[PDB]
Amino acid sequence: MDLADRFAELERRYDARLGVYVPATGTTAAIEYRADERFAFCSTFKAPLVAAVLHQNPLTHLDKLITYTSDDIRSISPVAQQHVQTGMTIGQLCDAAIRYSDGTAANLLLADLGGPGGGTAAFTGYLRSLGDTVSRLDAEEPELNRDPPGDERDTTTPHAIALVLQQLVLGNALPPDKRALLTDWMARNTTGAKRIRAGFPADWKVIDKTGTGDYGRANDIAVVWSPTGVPYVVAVMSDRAGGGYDAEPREALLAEAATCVAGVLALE
Numbered sequence: 001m002d003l004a005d006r007f008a009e010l011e012r013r014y015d016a017r018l019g020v021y022v023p024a025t026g027t028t029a030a031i032e033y034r035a036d037e038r039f040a041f042c043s044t045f046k047a048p049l050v051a052a053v054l055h056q057n058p059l060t061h062l063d064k065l066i067t068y069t070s071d072d073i074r075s076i077s078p079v080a081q082q083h084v085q086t087g088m089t090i091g092q093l094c095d096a097a098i099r100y101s102d103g104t105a106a107n108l109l110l111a112d113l114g115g116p117g118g119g120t121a122a123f124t125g126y127l128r129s130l131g132d133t134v135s136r137l138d139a140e141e142p143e144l145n146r147d148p149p150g151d152e153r154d155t156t157t158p159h160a161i162a163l164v165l166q167q168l169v170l171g172n173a174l175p176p177d178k179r180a181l182l183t184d185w186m187a188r189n190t191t192g193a194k195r196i197r198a199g200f201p202a203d204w205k206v207i208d209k210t211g212t213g214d215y216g217r218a219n220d221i222a223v224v225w226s227p228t229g230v231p232y233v234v235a236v237m238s239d240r241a242g243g244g245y246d247a248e249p250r251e252a253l254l255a256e257a258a259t260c261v262a263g264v265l266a267l268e
């Protein structure tokens with residue numbers, strides 16, 4: 001009963017492909033299950049996206065008001081819909097992209113980062129600047145969530161995104177003030193209750209960014225801290241391609257994979 005066997009039973013039971021990665025630490029081996037297989041980013045890109053915007057600009061740029069119209073809202077945009085008439089600051093947009101996975105907000109940030117038509121390449125660029133040669137973004141919201149299985153476009157791997165996240169929240173990719181903005185937004189994420197959060201004890205701190213898409217895609221990327229402040233990164237990615245484009249994703253698959261992880265991490 002190694003951990004791969006547990007993860008395998010999750011795949012059989014949920015009729016799903018599961019990718020897990022937890023980086024090695026000074027005292028823990030890496031946990032890897034299909035860690036180098038590709039999976040669609042879905043909204044998980046929005047956390048490194050906010051880092052890219054933060055990194056490239058002074059903090060005052062978060063005060064810049066971005067105006068848009070209803071025609072820009074071509075995907076699920078719970079916060080952009082409430083502020084359509086009055087606009088949103090760059091900071092508000094980072095907030096919305098992360099905490100509510102707002103589609104329009106991510107697209108506007110992509111435009112800020114690389115101009116219209118340059119955003120996805122510029123975001124991909126930021127990942128390469130962090131030594132991630134694997135991940136790629138090619139489309140905006142909503143198309144990015146809708147590539148077919150096996151399409152390399154708009155994919156990362158659990159391994160690659162976990163190491164990106166580690167550098168962003170736990171290493172020195174961002175200065176401490178910008179880093180804390182990113183961390184705070186992910187800590188107050190509202191979409192992640194039934195995924196990695198549900199598999200860690202309440203006294204562990206969890207920050208995360210979810211992703212959901214076609215072919216039953218459900219992702220979550222988290223940084224967690226043990227009750228005495230020991231940090232770990234957890235990438236949990238999944239799809240259910242057998243049910244077709246409209247396949248229902250299963251959040252409980254992620255909660256279980258995360259419970260497996262937490263079980264290993266919390267035991268002495």
Ligand SMILES: *C(=O)/C=C/NCC(=O)CCO
Binds near residue numbers: 214
């Ligand atoms: C971030 O992952 C946004 C995803 N939007 C598409 C869906 O959520 C598909 C089903 O709602």
